[PDB]
Symmetry: C2
Subunit: 148 residues, 2 copies
Amino acid sequence: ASGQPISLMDGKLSFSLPADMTDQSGKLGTQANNMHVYSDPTGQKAVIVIVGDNTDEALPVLANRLLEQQRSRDPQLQVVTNKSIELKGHTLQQLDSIISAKGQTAYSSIVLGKVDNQLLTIQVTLPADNQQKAQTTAENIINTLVIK
Amino acid sequence: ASGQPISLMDGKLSFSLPADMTDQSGKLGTQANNMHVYSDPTGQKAVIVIVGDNTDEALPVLANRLLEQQRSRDPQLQVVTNKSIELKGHTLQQLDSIISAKGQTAYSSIVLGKVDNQLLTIQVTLPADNQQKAQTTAENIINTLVIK
């Protein structure tokens, strides 16, 4: 099954993907202004950073929405962490989960923040074949975060 | 080993990643104007579309540079396909490879084009545990491409 056709380059470029593949920006309906992608050579370890317009919706509520989106795709979703974290005056929300689809398993660590009147989303996804190693790697990345 | 610190949001946000994780934009030194990311829920199946400024460098030469970047990270890189393809007057270049890093294996299909005086890059990465299935899926995605 392919998904709906995708149009890019103001309609000049179009294609179709397997139906399970979806746009990684706009998952919260907010318009993304900036996106950055870091990955290993295989793309299986990835960090996506999105900066978009602010929303009035509280960060725990956004986190709960992302959790529900994940659970709609994966009825066995594991929630590892769903909590507030403090970075120098800023409350951020961290949602860690083990997501399974079609024999792929990932450890996902999402941090949400409201920074300089913008919604900041950081999504870490790592192969979770070794669940403990993936968890450690994600936590280690999150530990490095600094807001100036 | 972590990599060099990463600064985003005009220096307001900083963090560090495992050293094997790198920025997926600017791999050809061209400045990226637009980036789109599609992925399955685990992020292990992904399509990244980048639109940047044109370059004078010929598309087979750019493809050869990407191949060499891949081979510097993976001394056992498999090149499956490295060829020109014709889409309605446009020559595109397609580079398919099997990339291995740290017990992760991906099938990578990259299409390069010069469209409306812009460098178009489409990078498909899929788990290659079943090499034939990953290859088929990537080819099927590429078959859907249309330039208007």
